[PDB]
Amino acid sequence: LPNITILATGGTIAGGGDSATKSNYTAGKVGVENLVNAVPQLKDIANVKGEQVVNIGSQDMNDNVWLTLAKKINTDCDKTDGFVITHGTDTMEETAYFLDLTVKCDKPVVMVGAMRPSTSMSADGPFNLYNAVVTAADKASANRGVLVVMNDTVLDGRDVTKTNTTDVATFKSVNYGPLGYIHNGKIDYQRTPARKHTSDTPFDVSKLNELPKVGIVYNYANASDLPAKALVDAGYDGIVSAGVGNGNLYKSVFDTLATAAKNGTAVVRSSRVPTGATTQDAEVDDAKYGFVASGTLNPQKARVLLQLALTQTKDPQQIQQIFNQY
Amino acid sequence: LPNITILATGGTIAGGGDSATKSNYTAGKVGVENLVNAVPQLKDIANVKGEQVVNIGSQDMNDNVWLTLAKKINTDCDKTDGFVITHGTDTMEETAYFLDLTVKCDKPVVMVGAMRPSTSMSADGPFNLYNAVVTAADKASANRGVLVVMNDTVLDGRDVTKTNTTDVATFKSVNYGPLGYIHNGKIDYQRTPARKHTSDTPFDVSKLNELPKVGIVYNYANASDLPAKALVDAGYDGIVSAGVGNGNLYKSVFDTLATAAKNGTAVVRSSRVPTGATTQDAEVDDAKYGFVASGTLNPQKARVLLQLALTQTKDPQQIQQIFNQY
Amino acid sequence: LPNITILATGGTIAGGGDSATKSNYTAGKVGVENLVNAVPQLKDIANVKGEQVVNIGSQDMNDNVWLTLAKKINTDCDKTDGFVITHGTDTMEETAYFLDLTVKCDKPVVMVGAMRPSTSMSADGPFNLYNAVVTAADKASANRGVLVVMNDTVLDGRDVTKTNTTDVATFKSVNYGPLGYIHNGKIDYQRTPARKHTSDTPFDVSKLNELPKVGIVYNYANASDLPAKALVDAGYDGIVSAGVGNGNLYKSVFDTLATAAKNGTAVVRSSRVPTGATTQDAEVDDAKYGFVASGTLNPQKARVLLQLALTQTKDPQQIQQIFNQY
Amino acid sequence: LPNITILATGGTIAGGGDSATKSNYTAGKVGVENLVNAVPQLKDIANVKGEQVVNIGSQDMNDNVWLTLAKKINTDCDKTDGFVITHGTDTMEETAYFLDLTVKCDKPVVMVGAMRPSTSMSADGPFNLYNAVVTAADKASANRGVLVVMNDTVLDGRDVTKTNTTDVATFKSVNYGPLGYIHNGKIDYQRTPARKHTSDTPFDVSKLNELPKVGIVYNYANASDLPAKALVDAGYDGIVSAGVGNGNLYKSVFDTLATAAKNGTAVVRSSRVPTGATTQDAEVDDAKYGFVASGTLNPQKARVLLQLALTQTKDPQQIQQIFNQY
Ligand SMILES: N[C@@H](CC(=O)O)C(=O)O
Ligand SMILES: N[C@@H](CC(=O)O)C(=O)O
Ligand SMILES: N[C@@H](CC(=O)O)C(=O)O
Ligand SMILES: N[C@@H](CC(=O)O)C(=O)O
């Protein structure tokens, strides 16, 4: 059987409450060893070694954990046949895309979580973790980039996003769809992500102890420019606009970011709209203002690519070409 | 035939480009008379009257236009049989929900936009506008609150949200689904919102020339607390958290809003996640911190209700009751 | 605590396999008492009483079980506070709609199943059953027609359909959306079905020991008229067409069904396409052929209403009005 | 510019009513040249030729039109740079998948329809046809198999299905998602189908004037075996079961098809359920009965492949392997 390393960061999958029927719970309580022990059928599928990286709610996920995870997977790539990362669902899609761009290991890296705590009735965590190990162990799962496995579905790290606040079926690749469905411990893969990922990226965080500072500003009716001005005053390297519709900006936000873009700051236009691309030739002349259009990358995912783009270049046209390639 | 009044505010429905096939256009440049005359079949179903209120892109929508729209509808209520509001798609879901809470006219208020400019090859605006007046002219549309009519579907002002950046079908009521479908100028209504609207709300904006200051902060991996601090430093009346997953906050954003809530700022927990409720009784103890759970209201819709809730009370407990009723 | 009767008919919820991690299983194996005892937290919320009516896979569901179920709920109404029906997922949407039309008990009737067998890892059945009793116990669930509770969601029996083949979240009200969502054993109801249900229908099956014979024919490229001719030759009281697109017929199937309609067979145009109404005033002149347009009712559900319609009348115009009202 | 041939079969795209306002229309009415002249901008992006193959509603589509279409494209492959096929929406998902498996030309074959007739207000036909020619003219569109272009989206011929009866956004690849989105005459392709197609399939219809007869039977509560028995009596080479849930069959229909499978009839288990695979190793022992699991292929699409499968082999294990490859 293949050897696979479970890297535990915490989440509701490692979360517990005082009863199976009450909704109240705390994330990142239970250890990796207790998770694997709860699913003995793992032994039938792979030789599992569990390592606790951190034990955190993914709402408190950060650059330092991102850095640790990338370096760990890249360092330990030769000493295992595949990786599973147990992780909270809140920012799974951010971590998944960071590693999708920064992992140089060509062996399956599969992220997994749970929407119900481990102590709850009909807890999704156990079967989620089994299916994650199935995917990480499947020979066919290699060279498809960093994967998320949730609700019997294999999702690429770029397009995967949390669509619902409670539903176990929350995770979908809302623009281009899933890679494959898992039935009876077997995957029928019909799709691979075309955007370049892992070893096909120039992003190398092996020596980096931090990432360039990129914040996100929300657009809406009567939107305050104070958030944008706060990141600008702090000398932020990048600002992602969660725009309205096709990445459009409230007038006062537009004013601040137009200034910022010409005074150092890399400005990427994304959208609060959960589905579809922020396009170039819309109502915003990106060439004129020196903006970057995120495309299908939602605000949090645009932040990831911009941060990593900023380790390579400050030039908008090159960042835009990066946003057209990765 | 019924008398219906068209209140124009701008949008891509009033948008124009040099090419029917190129995607480049500018918003809110075409006058209401032109949109009506473009649809001569309108005078088969209703006697239409056009009034230009503003001519702006809804990305620049604001408190002042909202207050104007509500006062005009409330003033002209019994001079007409119903209202259609032509409007940009970007923030139509915000304006729709504001009018839903503040309009005291029991006659149909139907908001309509277009995802392609008026000059576009297969422009959606014409049939959109026709179906908007059809809905506004339908006696069965009465007492359903403020409506959004897009892609042959009647959508309630509360749940309706922009789902896709470019798709004509973008507008869906993602949690509770639509009220009715339109075919051959007739509507089969099978739903009406339970949540109280229009004249059933205690909200009265008739004597208001400003609305309380409510800003929105985004949550993500390594989220900056500077946007939040900026808003409490400017003395903002309320702050809505665009939370991660089930309304969860990055620790730094949590600390700032926890301090703001104790100091007397109204703090509402919403979600970046496009469908589902931000619930009580998950990971955040709302009673302890004096936070409010937004429920199914997304950040920009949570802002509309928090603003109006603050014209009534500053008590977090009574703001939660309002978020449970409207 | 309220008194809640569990009527078990079988399904995957009562299904079993040799392994928790193996797909293979048989339906309708384990009895009511085993199901109820498997979730002892029911004792917190209701006084639960189990009755086995059948133990079958709902692929084998039939007129006889429907009649028994209906008469059982109608006769035993004033003995209990609510009913939960454990049932296979395959035809829950048919049974739910039958009871939606035939139950006269004004108390909550909630139907439940499981997409994973009882022996499965992360079995959905236990928490599905708990949430069903919650719904059946909630006073707010009254006067909403017969309900389906799956994946923390309360769904009206009319619009609810199986959307996916293996997904625990399979059940969606695809046209008009759910009635409410369940969190921490509490329901926020925002919707109720407008279409007449339960006591508001004239469909009394109390003294019927048989239902009118209604079959379904599928439409496709080069469709055979033989399935249709077989049902006409057996003298079937009604035929519903699973039409292509907006309930359109292949010429051969059209030819057979047209002649049958004029001979006194009730012919209902439904659609194979999973969402949207089969509409009047499309490509087919219903009035000329004496066909009935199923509207939002899919072929399965078109069958259930036609059967019940054929107990009141054989007149196409009357059946059409029945399809517009129920 | 590229040379693009347009092959017209009819459809609502070639459909007309007596009013832009009213829904009533007749399909396959308008000639290919009238569609071309209705889109002047075609000449900007390609040198377009038009040929009427047939002019029918696709509800009357059949094997004869399929074989002609496949042979035409295969013969005239060298004469042009790409094909667009104007086609009805009702059975376009069937024609697309047949061509997907039979056309040996490696140049883009793009299918288009319109949900609104050419005479309708905001008719989708014109911009649909433009965007089809864009896709057909894009070199990046090559080697992706037969395509469907509807609502600014490029969909693979295998997974694409009609999702809604009237909605312009009706066509979705519901299991694996679209290939690319079309903005401003340009496509961001991020996906290609892994399943083998066009010239990579062993299927050759070049010499065939007939297709193996394959019929479809529908499963539901109390399902008549008469339709299935009628096909077996007429000596059908194949029967596809529109199963319930995971391709399950009612008692009556199961016995008939179990009998049929033993006596040489190739029987494929599909599902009425609009998304997800009909899998092996559930409740039906496929080996024991000699049945074939359709996977993600819905009944009408399982028919297409079973017809082509039956020109190679009548061995159920050979046919199953074909359903795992194409
Ligand atoms: N707050 C949790 C939510 C979850 O995992 O379901 C986390 O992301 O860590
Ligand atoms: N920016 C435009 C978008 C549209 O109307 O489609 C607006 O909202 O005004
Ligand atoms: N065949 C089963 C499927 C399920 O219940 O999930 C039934 O409907 O009884
Ligand atoms: N009946 C038409 C429907 C359409 O094209 O929209 C056809 O398929 O030909």
UniProtKB/TrEMBL annotation, chains A, B, C, D:
Protein name as annotated: asparaginase
The gene designation is: ansB
Q: Provide the E.C. number(s) assigned to this enzyme.
A: 3.5.1.1
**Could you give a single Gene Ontology term from the biological process aspect?**
asparagine metabolic process
Q: Can you give the residue ranges of the L-asparaginase N-terminal domain?
A: 3-194
Location of the protein in the cell: Periplasm
Sorted alphabetically, which InterPro entries does this protein's record hold?
AsnASE_II, Asp/glu_Ase-like_sf, Asparaginase/glutaminase-like, Asparaginase/glutaminase_AS1, Asparaginase/glutaminase_AS2, Asparaginase_C, L-asparaginase_C, L-asparaginase_N
User: What catalytic reaction does the record list?
Assistant: L-asparagine + H2O = L-aspartate + NH4(+)
Note whether Chaperone occurs among the keywords.
no
The record lists the lineage as:
Bacteria, Pseudomonadati, Pseudomonadota, Gammaproteobacteria, Enterobacterales
Cite the Asparaginase/glutaminase C-terminal domain residue spans from the record.
213-323
Q: Which organism is it from?
A: Escherichia coli
Pfam families in the cross-refs: Asparaginase, Asparaginase_C
Q: Which UniProt keywords apply?
A: Disulfide bond, Hydrolase, Periplasm, Signal
